[PDB]
Ligand binder design. Sequence first.
Ligand SMILES: [N]S(=O)(=O)[C][C][C]C1234B567B89%10B5%11%12B5%13%14B%15%16%17B8%18(B961B%18%152B5%163B%11%1374)C%10%12%14%17
Ligand SMILES: [Zn+2]
Length: 257
Amino acid sequence: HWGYGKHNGPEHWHKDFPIAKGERQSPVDIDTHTAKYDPSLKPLSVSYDQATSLRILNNGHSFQVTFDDSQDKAVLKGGPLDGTYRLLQFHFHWGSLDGQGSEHTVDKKKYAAELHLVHWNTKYGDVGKAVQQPDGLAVLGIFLKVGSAKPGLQKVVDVLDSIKTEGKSADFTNFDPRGLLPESLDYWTYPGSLTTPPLAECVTWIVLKEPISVSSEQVLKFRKLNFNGEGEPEELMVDNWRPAQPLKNRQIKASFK
Ligand SMILES: [N]S(=O)(=O)[C][C][C]C1234B567B89%10B5%11%12B5%13%14B%15%16%17B8%18(B961B%18%152B5%163B%11%1374)C%10%12%14%17
Ligand SMILES: [Zn+2]
């Protein structure tokens, strides 16, 4: 029932998921002048060399690439994190035009899209258990701006025609998510939540300062997807982003000066 439209969008979500109005909701605006450099923060450790992608899926809210998370193959550690977080999937949020689409904003600036690599804490054993914990998930967030093409995104873009509508999926093996990363791993971090229902307050957010550049042709292919199932009135999958939420009693910390 939930979505991003007038009648089921972010302003409605609190009725089914009252934590929508909680103390540690995501996304937020990153005020770069207020974020405190924290020299105790470690560099982020991103170990994706043995990542095993499985499937690409249109879930009705975004598209996602799922990975084998039954061993420590593709893991996030270090940074603000204690212990080891396994990559489960990545997905994106994007706009109807280039001036909106990201969930986090930086000094109120919206990017055209935002990539989320979702990882869960292996000390909880599975992702259902992890989402019930305040340190269950770590989501690595990467901004997209429109410019030059991102070569490492092209293999994703070229199969989107095969998953146009909600429920469709396809084989998507041997995809290397290292090809989605910017040069710098400089980041901001804060405690937050899932940005979709169930909005569980279980996420350590790690948002990279450096955006990736994607081409107008790449993002245009995101915009051809459909929220609807096949045979329903065609409603383009665009503006699938939750707006910034109140920061409340939270501090955003920077890994960099
Ligand atoms: N936009 S976001 O905060 O990364 C939430 C992404 C959606 C999900 B929530 B649940 B938790 B894990 B799986 B399923 B839904 B799916 B993934 B994360 C599980
Ligand atoms: Zn997301």
